[PDB]
Amino acid sequence: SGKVVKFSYMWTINNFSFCREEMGEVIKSSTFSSGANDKLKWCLRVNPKGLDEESKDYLSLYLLLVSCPKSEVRAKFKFSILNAKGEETKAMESQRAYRFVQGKDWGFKKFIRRDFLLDEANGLLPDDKLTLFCEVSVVQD
């Protein structure tokens, strides 16, 4: 009876400003595991130019449950950006645990303003790299 119950996934998207993804198009991370015997599979999904018309000015960011042994899992999540010093910034966290099923995601449609992200003065794209950080806590398997 042993489980990975908390985990932090760090994802670097190189040459971010030159990403060709238009509105609605997704960038998908590699799959990562947790729970008992790697039985929970996750990934991240980002819309560099927003999910829809409302989020056009934003990067949209989601955590997707790919696979689980039962019907659902309930989990809290926090997304942030790592700056040039490797420090967390622009954090957003779920207000509570959310119900994930296979093929379902949860996240923030308006995670960060694109213009603020792209402005070199803000230091969020050092060497034009976006580093996203997702910390997950699983309440139930």
């Binding site: 999904r45 819309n47 949209s60 989601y62 957003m92 779920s94 207000q95 996240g107």
Partner: peptide, 7 residues
Amino acid sequence: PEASSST
């Protein structure tokens, strides 16, 4: 912050 799903 308001969480939402992309489906």
